[PDB]
Every structure is written in structure tokens, then in C-alpha cells.
Amino acid sequence: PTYPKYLLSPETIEALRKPTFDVWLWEPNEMLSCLEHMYHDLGLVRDFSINPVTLRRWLFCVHDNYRNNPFHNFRHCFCVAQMMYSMVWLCSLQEKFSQTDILILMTAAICHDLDHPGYNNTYQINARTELAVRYNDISPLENHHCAVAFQILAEPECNIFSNIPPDGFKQIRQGMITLILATDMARHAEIMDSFKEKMENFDYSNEEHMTLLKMILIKCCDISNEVRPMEVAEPWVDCLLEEYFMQSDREKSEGLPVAPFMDRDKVTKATAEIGFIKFVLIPMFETVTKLFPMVEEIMLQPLWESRDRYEELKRIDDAMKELQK
Amino acid sequence: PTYPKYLLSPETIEALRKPTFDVWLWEPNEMLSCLEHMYHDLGLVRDFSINPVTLRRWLFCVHDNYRNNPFHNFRHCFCVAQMMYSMVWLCSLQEKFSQTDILILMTAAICHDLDHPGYNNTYQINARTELAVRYNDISPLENHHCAVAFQILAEPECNIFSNIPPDGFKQIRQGMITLILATDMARHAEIMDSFKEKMENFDYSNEEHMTLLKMILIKCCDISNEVRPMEVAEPWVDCLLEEYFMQSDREKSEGLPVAPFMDRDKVTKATAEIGFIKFVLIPMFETVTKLFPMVEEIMLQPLWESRDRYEELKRIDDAMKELQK
Ligand SMILES: C[C@H](Cc1nc(=O)c2cnn(-c3ccccc3Cl)c2[nH]1)C(F)(F)F
Ligand SMILES: C[C@H](Cc1nc(=O)c2cnn(-c3ccccc3Cl)c2[nH]1)C(F)(F)F
Ligand SMILES: [Mg+2]
Ligand SMILES: [Mg+2]
Ligand SMILES: [Zn+2]
Ligand SMILES: [Zn+2]
């Protein structure tokens, strides 16, 4: 007949494997079925004896623990995991990674921003929040996301890892913590350097090489919005700014220091994006391309187009402002 | 948190294995989830590579094809499948049957009453309905349930067998057809005789022996209401009498004969149930017990209690009907 929304159609199931997937077309229920499909499809349910019902509860609990922020919400979570999913396919990651690593990658992606408050680490630290005090100023947000992820997993009804022997649990947990903590942008240069270092003569047998690679992969997915089609990507930039502005406005009010890139009276969307794409996104994806050449066509291409589009957009903006004076 | 109904709680999943499960507490969605869980739990999704999403679309389509009769509806379908599932564990059937047999048993239980009109074969035949004409008075309803079952599986989106090699499909199809046709009570004596004949020296390696055992298994589940707790079983009896009175009514105003056990003025519920329990249910489960001894305490027991309760009800009922005269 005509099946409910939570029963993905075979077209959806197919499109889900590509970075082109339009993440705005679905409601939480549908997004949850997509995430559920990914675990079955990647063979994770199979290889780790994941109780199919526990998987649904775990995903619903994860969903319940994401806040209603303009950017750091459940839909962003879906994007990251969905891009990680596309990359497993595009790069044929199952050929180079064990199932244990694929599991670490996917679960970390889904949990990386759990219970995000909507104010970055700088705000937590300057305002001396409970999180900043709890984590001694060390990546308070990322530490918290990871802690909430394991508190959820510690709930028996949500423990998708219930049938994994303790030695495997330890390995997975250590892997997730490492990846989630690797998403704090304050460590971007640091991580990128370590990767590029190993990249000179990459060894898929070297555990430290693989760890860095996995860190780079989750970082890619986390800030992979601009890799998506222009219509899918643009709205996210507005959501992010909306969140940054809310923070700066609050910092202005409470008398805390304000970061220029988050100040309403200073940031112009186009100009800012150009710098981000040009000096953060493109460079990072170029390094990944050396290992997975198919990335250039599938992900570097859209990044270049985005850079161009925004560079043009700025010219139009400058001329417009130049004319108003 | 507090999950939606379609997410079975771990308590429900546990209960689903026992014949004491309360089949009335659930809405189609929860029942659909239960059936899905059964296919994963028994290892069918795993061993036959059933696409987990197709499994759900299929269950939804099956549901859509059951009518809103008072007895022969989707909830009856859930009962039979659930009793079958319970029997698998009670009798440790996976030690005696292959996964293909289990798949045959489970899928046949679920499909055995598809698109039932609410009027039995005797009516179809006597009224010379389209079905009786189509199937030449040979188990018309059962033949139809079968046909519908395979028209459904013919739809790609609902074909839970799409990944089974053709030889496996044929074996499964043959098996399901045999079990569904075996539910026609007109053949009850025939089948019980043939089974008891083989029972004189049962051979688990003899294919004919196993065929009859599976037919007895599905017949057992099909009419196993009285095995369930009294609170669960009695409402089913009333639901059936509702259809029976609907038929006997229509048969009288059409000039077609009426089966005494369906005649309101002869079918004192208690007297009819006592007979059914004593000469159909008990004898059947009795022979099955000789093969699986544990069946006596778990299913033959409640049948005795049930037979005894209806006998008490009969006394009080006849007394009150004497005043009505
Ligand atoms: C600041 C944004 C661009 C941007 N997009 C991100 O996803 C992101 C993640 N972290 N950061 C970030 C945060 C703080 C400091 C530096 C950066 Cl790079 C980001 N900056 C814009 F240019 F306005 F569009
Ligand atoms: C129809 C009832 C007897 C009876 N009791 C059941 O619990 C039960 C379960 N399934 N069936 C059943 C349903 C459809 C066709 C045949 C049967 Cl046998 C039953 N029939 C009576 F005769 F009125 F007392
Ligand atoms: Mg984060
Ligand atoms: Mg029937
Ligand atoms: Zn993020
Ligand atoms: Zn039936």
C-alpha cells in the first residue's frame, strides 16, 4: 500500500550512501530509521550481535539527548553520521578498516555533540561554568559529549554494546573517546600536523597512523556541510551564525570577552566562509585525497565550487557596500 | 527516557517467548514490532539475508491484507505466530528443525488467514461464492490465503525472500503451501490419523515424518487459544461465536443449511467449548506431548483447567436457561 514515513523507501536507502543526500527533507523519525539502517547495512548489527531492538532504543535516547539549538542539534548529528556513512562507501573504508574501527567511526559520529549547550568552550571557560570547572578548562564540551554518550550506553536498555566481550568494549570506548575529543577545533592545527607528518609515508599497519586517520575522518564529517549541494549547505551556515551571535550577544551582556568572528557587528557571512573553506576545509580534504583519490571528484569539487560561489558573493557584496557610501 | 509504543521494552521481549503472553494489550504497531523481533531473534534475518527494511514493509503489507473480522483478523494472525514462536523455545525446535523449516513455520503462521471473509468453507461452497467456484470446493479459503500470501511476496518491496536462491524459494513456497492448506479443519481427522500413524515410530530424519509434524505444529498454534491464560482465551471464543452467528444468520436468510455448532439455539457456548477442548484440543496436544514431554505441563495443563472451568460454567448456564424457557 503506502507505508509510514519510518519505513524508508528503496530510493531513500540508495541515496543515503551519497554526500548529495538532502538532510532537510526528513523528520526525526525518518532520520532515526536511516541511522538504524546504516548499522544493519554496514554489518555492524551482525558482527557485534547488536540487539536490533536495543539499537532503536539507543538511537531514540541519543536523539532525546541532543538539545534544540540552531546548529548543534539532532539534524547536525544526522549529517555527520550520514557523511561518515557516505565516506565508508566512497573510499571503500571496509577494505582498509576492521569492523571494530567502522563501529567506532559511526558511533563517535552520532555521539560527538551530545547535549551541546549552544555556547562554545571559550564561553564555558570565560564564564567559569560548571562544565569548565568540572573539566578544568580542558575541552569541556567534547569531554561532556563523550561522557553523556557513555552514560546513555551504560543504560542496559540502550547498551548496543551489550554482547561485546569486555576486551572489545575497552577498545571501542578508547576509540570513541579519542575521536570525539578530536573534534574540538582548538586542536585542529595540532591534529592536522600530526596527520601530515605520518602522511609522508603512511602505513595502514601502524596503529598510530590509523588513529590519526580516523581522527581526520571524523573531523571531516563534523565540518562537512559545505561538501553538500549548495541548497543543502547554505542554510547550515545561517544556523551556525545564529548560534554564534546568540553567544556573543550574551557575552556582551554579561561583560565577557567577545570573539570577532562571532560578533554581529563584525562578521559578513560570505567573507567568513571564504576563509574557512579556503584555509580549513580544502586543505584538510586535500590531505585525505592522497590516500583516497576519489575524494577529489566527490568532495573537493563541491568545496571549490562553494569557494568560488562565496568569493563571487563577496565581490557583489563589496560593490554593493562601496556603492552605499 | 520514555520510548514510544513501537519500541518494545525488554520486559515485553522476554514475555513474548511464553504462551502466557497477553495478546490483547497491543496495538497493530506493537504487534508488528513483535513479529519483526521474532524474525531477528530466531536468526531468520541473518540466515536468509532478509533486508531488515523489507521485513517491516512486508509485515505492514500483510497487516493491511487482514480484514476487520471479529476473529479472523490480524490479531489472530499475531497469536498463531506468537504461539509458534513460543513453541520453538518450549520444545527447542531449532535442535530438530533446519532454519528453512523454522522460516516455513513462522511465515505460514503469519500468512495462514490472509484476507479471510469471515465465513468458513462450508458457507463458500454452499453459497457457490466466487471463491468456491475458483477453487472447485477444495479448501477454498486456505487456497486463497496462500494465493494472497504469494501475491504479496511477489511485490519486490515486500519480498522478504529476494536473497534466497531459487531452489530455496521453491522449497519454502512448497512448505508454506502445505502448512496453510493443512489448517482447514475439514482435514483434521485425516491429518491426525496420518500423524499418529507415523508416531508409532517417529523418525526426525524422515521428510514425510517432519512434514506431518510441521502441519500438526501449525494446526496446534492455529487453535491454541484455550492454552493461554483464561483471561486471554475467553474473549477469543466470543469473537469466533460472533462470526459464527453472523454466518448462521446469513445462511438461514438464504436457505442454506446451518452447522449445529453455529446455531444460536443449540450452541450453548460452554457445551461447545467443552466438546472442542475434549475431543480436538486435548487429544491433539496429547499426541504431540509424546514427542515433546514439556508440552504437557505448559499447554496440556491449562487445557484441563479450561475444560474444567467450562464444565462449571455449563451447569450455571443450563440452570439459567431453564428459567428463560
Ligand atoms: C565561523 C564560520 C565558519 C566556521 N564553520 C564551522 O563549521 C566551524 C567550526 N568551528 N569553527 C570555528 C570556531 C571558532 C574559531 C574558528 C573556527 Cl574555524 C567554525 N567556523 C563562518 F566563517 F562565520 F562562516
Ligand atoms: C468454534 C468453537 C470451538 C473453537 N474453539 C476455539 O478456541 C477455536 C480456535 N479456533 N477455532 C476455530 C476457528 C476457525 C475454524 C475452526 C476452528 Cl476449530 C476454534 N474453535 C465452537 F465450536 F463454537 F465451540
Ligand atoms: Mg562538537
Ligand atoms: Mg483459516
Ligand atoms: Zn559537530
Ligand atoms: Zn487461523
Numbering used by the authors:
A (entry chain B), B (entry chain A): 181 to 505
From the paper:
Cyclic nucleotide phosphodiesterases (PDEs) hydrolyze the second messengers cAMP and cGMP, and play crucial roles in many physiological processes. PDE molecules contain an N-terminal regulatory domain and a conserved catalytic domain at the C-terminus. To understand the roles of the invariant glutamine, we mutated Gln453 of PDE9A2 to glutamic acid (PDE9Q453E) and its stabilizing residue Glu406 to alanine, and measured the kinetic parameters of the mutants. In addition, we performed molecular dynamics (MD) simulations on the mutants and determined the crystal structures of PDE9Q453E in complex with the inhibitors 3-isobutyl-1-methylxanthine (IBMX) and (S)-BAY73-6691.
In the Q453E mutant structure, the side chain of Glu453 rotated about 15°. This movement made a distance of 3.8 Å from OE2 of Glu453 to O4 of (S)-BAY73-6691, and 3.2 Å to OE1 of Glu406. The 3.2 Å distance between two electron-rich oxygen atoms may cause energetically unfavored repulsion. A possible explanation may be that Glu406 is protonated, as discussed in the section on MD simulations. In the PDE9Q453E-(S)-BAY73-6691 structure, the conformation and position of (S)-BAY73-6691 to chain A was clearly defined by the electron density maps of (2Fo - Fc) and (Fo - Fc). However, the electron density in chain B had the quality only to reveal the binding location but not the accurate conformation of the inhibitor. In chain A, the pyrazolo-pyrimidine ring of (S)-BAY73-6691 stacked against the phenyl ring of Phe456 and its N5 atom formed a hydrogen bond with OE1 of Glu453. In chain B, (S)-BAY73-6691 formed no hydrogen bond with Glu453, but with Tyr424, although its pyrazolo-pyrimidine ring remained stacked against Phe456. The IC50 value of (S)-BAY73-6691 for the PDE9Q453E mutant was >160 µM, which is >1800 fold to IC50 of 86 nM for the wild type enzyme. However, since the selective PDE9 inhibitor (S)-BAY73-6691 fits tightly to the binding pocket, the Q453E mutation would cause a net loss of the hydrogen bond and thus impact on the binding affinity.
